[PDB]
Every structure is written in structure tokens, then in C-alpha cells.
RNA sequence: GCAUGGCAAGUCUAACCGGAGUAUCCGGGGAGGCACAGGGAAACCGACAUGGCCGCAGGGCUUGCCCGAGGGCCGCCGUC
RNA sequence: UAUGCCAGCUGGUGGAUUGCUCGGCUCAGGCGCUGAUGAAGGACGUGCCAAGCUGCGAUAAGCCAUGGGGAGCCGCACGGAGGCGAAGAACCAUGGAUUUCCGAAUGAGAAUCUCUAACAAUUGCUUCGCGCAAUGAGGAACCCCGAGAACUGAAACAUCUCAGUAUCGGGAGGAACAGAAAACGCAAUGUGAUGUCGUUAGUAACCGCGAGUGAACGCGAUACAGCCCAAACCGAAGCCCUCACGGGCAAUGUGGUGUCAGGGCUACCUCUCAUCAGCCGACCGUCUCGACGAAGUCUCUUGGAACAGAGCGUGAUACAGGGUGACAACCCCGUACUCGAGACCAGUACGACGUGCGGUAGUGCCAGAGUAGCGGGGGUUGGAUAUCCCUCGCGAAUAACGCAGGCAUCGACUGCGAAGGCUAAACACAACCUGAGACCGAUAGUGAACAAGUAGUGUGAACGAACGCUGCAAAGUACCCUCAGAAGGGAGGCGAAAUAGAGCAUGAAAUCAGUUGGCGAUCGAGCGACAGGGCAUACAAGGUCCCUCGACGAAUGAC
């Protein structure tokens, strides 16, 4: 039982997209968000840099933290970003909320899941 | 966004930018947690006498007389929990920590969130408040702080179509239960919160169910009584501005 | 509903036989009793090991990896820019109450760095020089001999 | 003291002089106008009208004032005992209104008139 | 340990101070704690921001083929 | 159909339940000593009638003064008789009078009485006389100095642990104690009296190296405050009693100087704003108490009673809480606002008086002994070689010296002067006042809401209960009848209600009387569950049910 109304709503949106549109990553991310918070992702920039690529949205089924350097001009989609992470990302690319990525890409295409 | 300032007659008088905080996502769960903490932290430590029931040399006769091994004195059972006049087994204790902690960041976020819930006419009506207005919170000029007679503040509220909320709170409830015997006989609905900047409205305070606070220290409770978001509030031109950096 | 809340009516509250939850015998003794007898298992073996040096003769080093320095060079605008030059002492937190500041060689160095510190590891030197950098030893650092 | 037990206690245990305040009744409009007071300590000379009991409506002269019990006897406000003897039916000053004052006391009238003090 | 929640390479204040609507509450307070490197009795020394291979989910493509976080198997590095 | 079974109805018994709270429990703020000028505590007295409680003390529920208060009053305690108060009583505050006997108990003796002037006893001063003084005892705990267990833990047990706990002896105050470095030892070019709070840390240290035990320096805060002798050099320049007179003390040193920013002495410079002694003497705040203090007691309906419903209206710097015949801001006390007094802060802070701070050079003049220290034996501590202490023995120096910096000796370095003394504030407790509460609500909560440490038990130390609720108002039942009758009963009266009628609100169960339904004197025992019948049943809150026939028709399935 999640307690955050925003997380609950987000999870429901993710589902709605996964079902309606042909997206399968949203329903996948939704299943991780339903799982215990401790299992959620906590990824620092150093990893997003090592495995991401341009024109491929990096999807973090958790939260992004500001440790390390990010140079690639990538679009990062997460549940939340540490104030530093968001700052460091918008410097070389773009940080986006999962709620936006669901609207901009309900088909969940050209996306890389990172944790 | 934009907030419409009102003069002491109930007529518009320009407008200012509704500060960003009122755009904070309403997070009732966090607001509820802050109110719970606030209410628990003012609760007083209590507990029965450490020695209640133990002031006796009572002893058990043991086997031999067809009686249960219960300590007795003058043929009267004592001390043990199952005995009348005996000690309370696991009673309330003074040593118990009845307080609750809350991270400053978490608490501040709830203040901002409750503050934001103020600018939502739908939430406000849902919370139970009675008014015939459309825009909210009700922004008023700094000259409100100069009012003296409560009756004056009434006419202003009647002008602002917000006085109905006070008719709502003008009904005390005589509670069910023994709280009555401890001075908690009555209870009443929460009405309008009046936030000013220099000092709390001495004029509005006595209004049925009203609360008066100051922008620098207004909290989660007055903003959301009982952890319920969306209280029909009225800010002061300066209060609004000051409340922004909270 | 919690576990405690469902106990009324269970009689034994999960202890099994009502003959179970009595005194210290049910625990095999009070506290750590029998740590090398009946309850030896998962206890570290008995005995003394080593010695300690007096607290006031011990030196506590303030350490930092190059990776940290290197990763924040741009962000460290409040520090000197050159042909970047940084006095580690002003970087590492807890540096006041420490006996000295040592730099360690973990990670990479993607910048021409000029570092000033009381101590450096062989790996810290190599890595910094391998990136066209210099290692400046403090006057305190002149203890190397 | 906001606690009910302490409130009721201080009333029942208040010393004699502090009990004068327990035998105060509301003054008529003419009297309120004339003395700048809303109520007054009912005296054995005053005349009063019953506003609340079974005797509400009736009027009469205050025959007695008991400070211990904080109650007054008003003329004709009686109860007929079994033997047929009419006896006084005690009244609380709160259910009563003063419509005439016995001003034979110099001191009473003095305080009754001075704006700085009450009676 | 676990579930929820805040913040995140950080996080939290303690006594205490000021304010106040005066035990709540608003603002100060990072002393200090834990985390940020380990190994060694000690002296003392001091590490992978990824080199290879499998491959789940997911994605891609001209529909078996690529990319494949996490995970698994190695390499390699600090120290005794 | 006896004796009788199950359930119900009427009445009872009982006192649960619900509602109520004059008592508790706990937290918080304030405040804090009393006593030979005989306390605290106890005994016995004291009232018109007086048994308990409270008060008081032969002047006995009280006497006097001042202030407040006010037309009433004569405690709890509501009777009867009587009395007091406008000559201002009651009641409240302050101050004073009185204040029996025992009691530290003090002339002597003694189970609260007695015998023939009394600080008994021990002390200091001393006119050497009890002439002037001191001590004694109490107090809720807190505080300081001594004595000091065991159950227990270690799954036995001895060191260890419980624990320097329980208990015991002695004693102070409103707070104690501590305290201006022979310190610390983040070793420093550093800190700078002492408590206490937070942390340092379950760290260092201890320990059948088992179980367990367990600091400090520092840091952040609170509050801040720093001084006086002994001696050197002076040498009676001095102090106490007494109005004075006069007496006493004091060369075995009173008094001056001086106290590590070492001092004295000698010669100089300069100067005082230190320090010490004495005078004056608060603000603010806080705690408590007090004054003043807004607005409906309007209509209708219900009711025994509006504080209810509906309608009309008002105050609010006051919508905290309580009272009042039912739910009250506006009926009464209060509550906001304003104002006043007392106490604490505090004889403190500020102020002023007096004094005189400091510096140079010279000077081996002075600077606390069974001490520092060593050894034997013990206790104690985390203190380990390196805690603190006791005991026996031994035992130094003299600043050109001495002690410390966690083993000893020597050297260096750094800190610092023991063996004399005083010291505000910040901290503990809760007797006392006041406030508060997601505490209990009469088998609870104190043992104690009640005669409560009461009744009562024990030779004694000691032990120790139970008992709350008529009603709006006593209107607490006149009169008549009956009766041995102030009993009880009948009739009757009051009230909304007596099934509110006195241990009287409500009034459960166990259970008792009478009574209704079912069963019943030829028949068998976990008392029932599920089926199906008899008999019984006011309404209400459930409304279904029966038979012919017909439609549908799983598995099964014939004559
Ligand atoms: Cl990461
Ligand atoms: Cl070590
Ligand atoms: Cl230091
Ligand atoms: Mg009890
Ligand atoms: Mg109830
Ligand atoms: Mg620090
Ligand atoms: Mg007047
Ligand atoms: Mg005698
Ligand atoms: Mg044992
Ligand atoms: Mg053992
Ligand atoms: Mg110990
Ligand atoms: Mg130390
Ligand atoms: Mg002197
Ligand atoms: Mg010991
Ligand atoms: Mg009891
Ligand atoms: Mg005996
Ligand atoms: Mg009854
Ligand atoms: Mg038969
Ligand atoms: Na007892
Ligand atoms: Na029995
Ligand atoms: Na507590
Ligand atoms: Na179990
Ligand atoms: Na059991
Ligand atoms: Na054990
Ligand atoms: Na810190
Ligand atoms: Na006191
Ligand atoms: Na008596
Ligand atoms: Na007396
Ligand atoms: Na004496
Ligand atoms: Na004498
Ligand atoms: Na054992
Ligand atoms: Na044994
Ligand atoms: Na041991
Ligand atoms: Na330090
Ligand atoms: Na009334
Ligand atoms: Na010795
Ligand atoms: Na030292
Ligand atoms: Na009782
Ligand atoms: Na039947």
C-alpha cells in the first residue's frame, strides 16, 4: 500500500498507457514501482553516461542522483531527480518526469531502461 | 498566477502575483503526518503511581489450606494483578516517549503543500467550508491589521461572501463521553484562518471557529486543521508576500 | 491489523506449549551466558588479539580520491584556474581536526591538475602526471625522509 | 481555572464575602439606565419579578437572602406543605429581575451610583 | 529486519538560543553521529567513474537478427 | 395430579450497567526552612444543648488594630431556644494579644502527673555571677560526610556481578557540594576556576580477558567572578564589652604591608579607576491575589421547569470554563482589554565613597613537612606499571628549588607552584502556592471521593478495610382507621415521577415468592446440533405459506 497519492496516480497512468497504447515498458516500470521502495532504482549520473545513447530515452524506474559526470545529450525519464541530478542533466541534455514521457511517448518506443 | 486584492469595503483594489508556493502539489499524506506530529507533541506524560498496589507485606500461605497461592494480608488478597486493590500489570508510564519526530524538510514541504491547498476553491468546499466565492485564498489589504471591532470584520466578510463559514462554525457540539468531566465538554467546526504580517487579528479572533496567525509562523495545523487540506483562509497583502519564502 | 492485535484468544501468544515462555532457562541463560558452551555457535572465539597504541600517539589522515577532485573541477569555480590548480586542504571536509591531508589514486584524471597536499599515494602521483599534471608537497609534506 | 471540577469547587467553597456575587440578579431597564449596571446583589429590601420558574410572571418583595446556599425568598412564592402551612420556595437570583431597590443603606446607594464601583 | 515517507553523495540535528499564538508551534543551532575506502596486531600502505563473455526484462530491425540496465561468469586493482 | 423440569410474566433480593464527580494519578511554573522568644508532634480542655471533625487555648469555633467587604450572620451541621450586626457584624488580608500539660524538654522526678528556684548537659566570652551567648529537635524529598549486605547474574560457583545498591550512624541549606591550576597535554605559536546539559562513547581502560564493567581531555551549550591569609619588611600603630566610667584580649603578635599580572627591601618612573571595605539601592520580568468589565432573559409550540424546536434581535480586544429546574457568548460568576497590590528576583545590578593599579634596576630577604616521595598490607576505581583512599614503617628540597605531562632512572622541552582560606550565578527535591491533562471515574484511581491511617487486629515493632447519587423545590407525607405501638399496615396528601419515600437515579445476572405456557407420578442420564411433528402466541419491528393443474427439467431413470 503506497502512501503517496502522486506515486499512486503515476502508477495508474503508467498502466493506462501500457494497456491502451502498445507500450510494454510503462507496464514494466509500473510493476517495479508497485514493488517495495527499497527495490526501486537509485542511479547516479555515472551510469546513465556509461550505458545511454542519443535519440534513446533513458528510463529509470526509480530516482536519479547527482554523483558522477554526464556528457551525452540524452533525455532522462525518472520518478524523481535529486536537485543536483536535474541540474547536471539539463546542462547537457534534458531531465523529464515519467508523467511527461507517458504523454510524449505513450508507445514507449526507443527507450532504454537503466538502474 | 494572480491574486485579487480587496479593500475594507469588499471592492477590488488591483492585484498581485500569487506566489509560487501555492502551486505546490497538494500532498495530504504529508500534511496529515505533520498535524499528527503537532498534536502528539503537545500531549502530556502520565502514568499511575509506581507503588500503587505494592504497599503491603501480604504473603501467600502456600499449599495446605485449600486456597490458591495468592498473597494475602488480614485474610484479604493483595498486590497481585488479579486481586482487587492489586497492582496494575502493565499500566501507563511516565517514562514513555509520547512525542514524534519529523524531518524539517518533510515538515516544511507539508507547510508549503497545505499553503498551496489554500488556492483551490474545490478543495476548500470539499473540506467543508461554506462560502459563495470563486477565487481563493481571499486576499485583503494591509489595512486589515488596523481593524479593531470584531463587528467590522464581519461586514467585510459578508461583503466578501465568506461569512457563511462563520454561521457554519457558530454551533458548539456537546461531545459524547467522559472528556466532558475533564473540561473537554465542547467542540466546534473550524472556520476561516486569518493570516496577517505584524500581529494576529485581535479583531477577527473571537469570530466563531476562526483562527488568527502570522505569516512568519503560520503552520500546518492552522492551514489544515486535523490534517485536512484546504482551509478557507484570508491573507494580508503583505502576508501573501511573506508566506512565499516559507 | 498487526500480529500483537490478533493474540487475544490464542492463549499462548505464539510461544507454543504454555510451558515455554517462563524465565531465563528458555533463553539458555541470562544475556551472553554459555557463549562457549551450549550456545557457542555464531560467536567469535575466545581470547586476546593484538595491542592498541595510546590514542594521543595515533595520527588520523584526511583522505580523498582523485576521482572526487577531478569530477568536480568545473563546479569548483571558487578555486584557481591555470594553464586547474587546487590546494586539497581547502577541499576535503574534516580537514581541520585531522593530522594531515592525503590524496589517493582511485579513479581517473581527465584534466591537467596541479594538486597541493600533505601526502600523495604512488598511484595518485602517476595518474596525475599521466594527465600532464603536477603534485606539490606542502611544507608539512616535507616529512618524507 | 478552565477545569470543571475546580470551577464548581471554588463556588461551593468560596468564603462568605465572595458569596455575595452568587446572589446577583439582573436589573430592570429603567434601573440599568439609572445606575449604569446590568445587575446587582439582591437585598432583603428589593422588589423582584420571577422570570423562569413555575412562579415566572409573579412579582414580590425579597423576604430573605441566604449566602450559604446562595438563594432568596420572595413574597408569595411558597409551597403548601402537607399540614397546610405555606412555606417559601427558594429561588436562584439568576431566574430573577430586580424592579425596585431598598436604598436605606448609605453605603449601598453610594457604590450603586459611583461609576468606578459596582453593587 | 521489514513496509511506508523525505532528502540524497550525502543525511540528521543534540543540549541550547530568538520569536511567538508561550509545554504545541516558526526560525536558528551540524557539537557530534552514520555514510563517503579499504587492508594490517602495528608500523605503514592505499582500490574498476568498466576490459571480456553469457543473458532476463525492455528496446531496435527489413522479424530470425542487433542493442541489451539489473543479474550471472571472468579479468583486473588496494592491502595483509 | 402431587413432589417437579424448561421459559416467561408480576413483585422481590442483589448492586452490575449507563450517566454523574467534592477524590485520585501525572506533568509543569512559582516558592522554600522551623526550634530554648520552647518548634514540629501529642495529651487534655474549649460550644446554650456538642458524640465526631475543624478551629481555638482558662481571653479557648475565639480578643484587638488597620485595610477590604457588606446586610447579613452565629464552622462542617438544614434542630430547638436564644443572640449578634448601620456604634458597619459576617467574611478576607496584614499585623498584634492570649496561647493549659507532655513534648529537643533544660531545676528534680514521672505512661501527659508531681515535688522543692533552676539555660539540665556540653561549650565560648567572661564583671568568673548562668552576667552575655551557643548547641540539642523537626522537616516531602533533595544535599554532604561516614558504615555497608544478600537474594540475583555468571544458566553451578569462589574473583566478578547485584552495588557502593538496600539498610544503618552523623550533619547543612533553600538549595547543597564544588571552585580560581603544583590544571589540561586535540603537544600546541594551544586551552584557561567550578558545577550542570548535550556529545565524545559503550570509545580508552577493567575482567575465571568469562559473564559483565566502564571513564576522561576536547567540543557545543547554560551561567560566568574573582578574591583573602601564613611569611618577608613594619612592631602595639590593634580588637571585643560598656551610654560613660571602667574592664577584657594582645610581644606565644592585635594591627599595617603582602599573596605568581610573585611579594618584601633599596634607588628610581609613573600613576590611581584594579582590587578590597563600607553607603545607596531599583526597572523589567515572573508567580500569586485583586478592581473594572459588552450583549435578549422578546414571540409561538412542547415541557413540571426552556438552557429545546420555529421566529425575531444583540455583543465580541470577551465563541476559555462553571452555575442556573434540559443543548446559554448576550440569565448569574467569569472570560478579552486596562488597571492595582504582594512576594521572589535582590540588598542584587547601576550609582557614589574611600583605597590605590602598574613599570625599571639591584637584592640566594619571604613563600604552608611526617608533607613530596619510597616501602609493607588492605579497600576502592575504567584507571590498566598509569584511580582515589586507609593503615604500618620510612622519608626531601627550598625557587639557584619543587610538582606534573598515564611504567622506572638521567637529560631536554612544555605546563604549573602542593602540604592555609573564602567565593555570586547556571543544576537537585517537592513540603508549600497555582496551573495543566488523547490519565482513572467509586472492585477504577491513593490505603483513603465516605468517621481514613478512621473502624478494627497484634504485647509490640507493625498491620488495616468497606461505605459516593431523594427531589426543580422538603413540597421529607396532615387527617382518619387498625395495632401492645412515634412499629408496621390500610385509606389519604405532595410531586412530571414515590416502581424518586430516606444506604431513596438507573436497577443486570445468580436467585426467591406468586403466577402463565409446554411437559408430567411406566420410565434413562453432556442437557444439544440438523430434520420433522403437537400444543402455545395482541400490536410493532419479518411476510410469507399450502393444494389442483401447467411450464422448465441436471445426474439418475422405470412399471
Ligand atoms: Cl549508480
Ligand atoms: Cl593502535
Ligand atoms: Cl585544549
Ligand atoms: Mg488499584
Ligand atoms: Mg460511554
Ligand atoms: Mg565538525
Ligand atoms: Mg455603580
Ligand atoms: Mg522536666
Ligand atoms: Mg548463578
Ligand atoms: Mg561461565
Ligand atoms: Mg562497577
Ligand atoms: Mg584528561
Ligand atoms: Mg590584610
Ligand atoms: Mg570493585
Ligand atoms: Mg478504592
Ligand atoms: Mg504475635
Ligand atoms: Mg432505585
Ligand atoms: Mg402416568
Ligand atoms: Na499500607
Ligand atoms: Na477455594
Ligand atoms: Na515521557
Ligand atoms: Na512464535
Ligand atoms: Na506461554
Ligand atoms: Na545464553
Ligand atoms: Na557536522
Ligand atoms: Na515555597
Ligand atoms: Na461536637
Ligand atoms: Na495561637
Ligand atoms: Na539555651
Ligand atoms: Na555563668
Ligand atoms: Na543460573
Ligand atoms: Na546453587
Ligand atoms: Na574478575
Ligand atoms: Na578541535
Ligand atoms: Na437562570
Ligand atoms: Na601505603
Ligand atoms: Na601537566
Ligand atoms: Na464504592
Ligand atoms: Na415446534
- Helix (H) or strand (E) holding A108, with range, is none
The CATH number assigned to the domain with range C1-50 reads: 4.10.990.10
The contacts found for B224-227 with CB under 8 angstroms, 24 or more apart, are B224/B31, B224/B35, B224/B114, B224/B117, B225/B35, B225/B190, B226/B35, B226/B190, B227/B28, B227/B31, B227/B32, B227/B33, B227/B34, B227/B35, B227/B36
Query: Residues 6 or more apart from B85 whose CB is under 8 A from it?
Result: B53, B76, B78
> What would the grid cell of residue B72 be?
494475602
Residue to mutate among A1, A2, A6, with most B CBs inside 10 A, is A6
CA atoms within 13 A on the CB side of A24: 1
User: Cα dihedral angle (B131, B133, B134, B135), rounded to 10 degrees?
Assistant: -100
Is C98 in contact with C60 (CB distance < 8 Å)? yes
Helix segments in C8-140, DSSP class H: 66-71, 122-129
Instruction: With beta carbons under 8 A apart, name residues in chain A contacting B27.
Output: 4-6
- Cα–Cα distances in angstroms (integers) from residue D10 to residues B63, D19, D22, in the given order: 55, 10, 12
State in Å: Cα B54 to ligand 20 middle.
24
- Do the Cβ atoms of C101 and C79 come closer than 8 Å? no
What is the number of other CB atoms lying within 10 angstroms of the CB of residue A63? Answer: 16
Instruction: Name the one residue in this structure whose C-alpha cell is 448609605.
Output: D106
Residue D20 to residue C35: CA distance in whole angstroms: 79
Nucleotides of F strand lying within 7 Å of any protein CB atom: 19-23, 25-27, 68-74, 76, 78, 86, 88, 90-92, 153-156, 185-187, 204-205, 209-212, 216, 290-295, 297-298, 304-307, 315-325, 327-329, 331-334, 336, 384, 406, 434-441, 443-448, 453, 456, 462-466, 472-478, 492-494, 496
CATH architecture for segment(s) C51-144? Ribosomal Protein L15; Chain: K; domain 2 (3.100)
CA separation for the pair A29, A13 (Å, rounded): 11
CB neighbour list of residue A35: distance below 8 Å, 6 or more residues apart:
none
Specify the length of chain B in residues.
Answer: 246
Solved how?
X-ray
Q: Taking the domains of chain B in order of start, what are their residue ranges?
A: 1-246
For B86-99, give one letter per residue: b (16+ CB within 10 A) or e.
bbeeeeeeeeeeee
Q: How many domains does chain A have?
A: 1
Q: Which of residues 139-198 of B touch D (CB under 8 A)?
A: 180-183, 185
What is the distance between the alpha carbons of residues D22 and D91, in angstroms, rounded to a whole number? 12
What would the grid cell of residue D106 be?
448609605
Which residue, B141, B108, B109, B106, is CA-closest to B241? B141
Instruction: Return d(Cα B214, Cα B19) in angstroms, integer.
Output: 17
* DSSP code of residue C53: -
As a whole number of angstroms, the distance between CA D79 and CA A115 comes to 92
Neighbours of chain C (3+ CB pairs under 8 A): none
Give residue limits of the domains in chain C.
1-50, 51-144
Question: Domain containing A93: what range?
Answer: 1-115
Three-class DSSP category at C86: strand
Counting DSSP H helices and E strands in chain C, the numbers are: 2, 6
Containing B208, the helix (H) or strand (E) segment is none
| Reported structure resolution in angstroms | 2.7
**DSSP E strand stretches across chain D:** 24-27, 39-41, 47-50, 59-66, 71-74, 78-80, 86-88, 96-100
Residue B125: phi and psi, rounded to 5, are -75, -35
C-alpha cell at B80: 497481585
- Nearest-CA distance B175 → chain D (Å): 15
DSSP A67: -
Contact D108, D43 (CB under 8 A): yes
Q: How many other CB atoms are found less than 10 A from the CB of residue B125? A: 15
Domains and CATH numbers, chain D: 1-119 (2.30.30.30)
Tell me which CATH code domain B1-246 carries.
3.40.1370.10
Distances, alpha carbon B215 to alpha carbons A23, A37, B8, B76, B196, in Å: 48, 36, 20, 64, 6
* Cα nearest neighbour of B182 on chain D: D3
Contact C117, C141 (CB under 8 A): yes
The Cα-based distances of C116 to C66, C122, C135, C142 in angstroms read: 12, 15, 6, 12
Which of B24, B29, B116 should one mutate to test binding to chain A, selecting the residue with the greatest count of A CBs within 10 A?
B29
Burial A29-58 (b: 16+ CB within 10 A, else e): bbebbeeeeeebbebbbebbbeebeeeebb
Show Cβ contacts of residue A85 under 8 Å, excluding neighbours closer than 6 positions.
Answer: A44, A45, A64, A65, A66, A95
What cell was used for B71? 498473597
Amino acid at each position: 500500500s503506497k502512501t503517496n497519492p502522486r506515486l499512486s496516480s503515476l502508477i495508474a497512468d503508467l498502466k493506462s498507457a501500457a494497456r491502451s497504447s502498445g507500450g510494454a515498458v510503462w507496464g514494466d516500470v509500473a510493476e517495479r514501482l508497485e514493488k517495495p521502495r527499497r527495490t526501486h532504482a537509485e542511479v547516479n549520473l555515472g551510469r546513465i553516461e556509461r550505458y545511454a545513447q542519443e535519440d534513446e530515452t533513458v528510463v529509470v524506474p526509480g530516482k536519479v542522483l547527482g554523483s558522477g559526470v554526464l556528457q551525452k545529450d540524452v533525455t532522462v525519464a525518472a520518478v524523481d531527480f535529486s536537485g543536483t541530478a536535474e541540474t547536471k542533466i539539463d546542462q547537457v541534455g534534458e531531465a523529464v518526469s515519467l508523467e511527461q514521457a507517458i504523454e510524449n511517448n505513450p508507445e514507449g518506443s526507443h527507450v532504454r531502461v537503466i538502474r | 498566477m494572480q491574486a485579487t486584492i480587496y479593500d475594507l469595503d469588499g471592492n477590488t483594489d488591483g492585484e498581485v502575483d500569487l506566489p509560487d508556493v501555492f502551486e505546490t502539489p497538494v500532498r495530504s499524506d504529508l500534511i496529515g503526518k505533520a498535524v499528527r506530529a503537532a498534536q502528539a507533541n503537545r500531549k502530556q506524560d502520565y502514568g499511575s503511581d509506581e507503588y500503587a498496589g505494592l504497599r503491603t507485606p501480604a504473603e501467600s500461605f502456600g499449599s495446605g489450606r485449600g486456597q490458591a497461592h495468592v498473597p494475602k494480608l488480614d485474610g484479604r488478597a493483595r498486590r497481585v494483578p488479579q486481586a482487587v486493590k492489586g497492582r496494575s500489570a502493565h499500566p501507563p508510564k511516565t517514562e514513555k516517549d509520547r512525542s514524534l519526530d519529523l524531518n524539517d524538510k518533510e515538515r516544511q514541504l507539508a507547510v508549503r503543500s497545505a499553503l498551496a491547498a489554500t488556492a483551490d476553491a474545490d478543495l476548500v468546499a470539499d473540506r467543508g467550508h461554506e462560502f459563495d466565492r470563486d477565487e481563493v485564498p481571499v486576499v485583503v489589504s494591509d489595512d486589515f491589521e488596523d481593524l479593531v471591532k470584531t463587528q467590522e470584520v464581519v461586514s467585510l466578510l459578508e461583503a466578501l461572501d465568506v461569512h457563511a463559514d462563520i454561521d457554519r462554525a457558530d454551533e458548539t457540539k456537546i461531545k459524547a463521553g467522559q472528556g466532558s468531566a475533564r473540561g473537554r465538554k465542547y467542540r466546534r467546526p473550524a472556520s476561516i484562518l486569518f493570516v496577517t504580517s505584524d500581529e494576529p487579528s485581535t479583531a477577527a479572533r473571537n469570530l466563531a471557529g476562526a483562527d488568527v496567525a502570522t505569516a512568519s509562523e503560520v503552520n500546518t495545523e492552522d492551514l489544515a486543521p486535523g490534517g485536512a487540506p484546504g482551509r478557507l483562509t484570508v491573507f494580508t497583502e503583505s502576508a501573501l508576500a511573506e508566506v512565499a519564502e516559507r | 491489523t498487526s500480529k500483537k492485535k490478533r493474540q487475544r484468544g490464542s492463549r499462548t501468544h505464539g510461544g507454543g506449549s504454555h510451558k515455554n515462555r517462563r524465565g531465563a532457562g528458555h533463553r539458555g541463560g541470562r544475556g551472553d551466558a554459555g557463549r562457549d558452551k551450549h550456545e557457542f555457535h555464531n560467536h567469535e572465539p575466545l581470547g586476546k588479539s593484538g595491542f592498541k597504541r595510546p590514542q594521543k600517539v595515533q595520527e588520523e589522515a584526511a583522505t580523498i580520491d582523485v576521482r572526487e577532485i577531478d569530477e568536480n573541477v568545473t563546479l569548483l569555480a571558487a578555486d584557481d584556474v591555470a594553464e586547474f590548480r587546487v590546494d586539497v586542504r581547502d577541499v576535503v571536509e574534516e580537514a581541520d581536526d585531522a593530522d594531515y591531508v592525503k590524496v589517493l589514486g582511485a579513479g581517473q584524471v581527465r584534466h591537467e591538475l596541479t594538486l597541493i597536499a600533505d601526502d600523495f599515494s604512488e598511484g595518485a602521483r602517476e595518474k596525475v602526471e599521466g594527465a600532464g599534471g603536477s603534485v606539490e608537497l606542502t611544507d608539512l609534506g616535507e616529512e618524507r625522509q | 481555572s478552565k477545569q470543571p471540577d475546580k470551577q464548581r469547587k471554588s463556588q461551593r467553597r468560596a468564603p462568605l464575602h465572595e458569596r455575595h456575587k452568587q446572589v446577583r440578579a439582573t436589573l430592570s431597564a429603567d434601573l440599568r439606565e439609572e445606575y449604569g449596571q446590568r445587575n446587582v446583589r439582591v437585598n432583603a429590601g428589593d422588589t423582584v419579578e420571577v422570570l423562569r420558574g413555575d412562579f415566572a410572571g409573579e412579582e414580590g418583595e425579597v423576604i430573605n437572602v441566604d449566602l450559604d446556599k446562595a438563594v432568596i425568598h420572595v413574597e408569595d412564592v411558597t409551597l403548601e406543605k402537607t399540614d397546610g402551612e405555606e412555606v417559601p420556595r427558594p429561588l436562584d437570583t439568576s431566574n430573577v429581575r430586580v424592579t425596585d431597590l431598598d436604598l436605606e443603606d448609605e453605603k449601598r446607594e453610594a457604590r450603586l451610583e459611583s461609576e468606578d464601583d459596582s453593587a
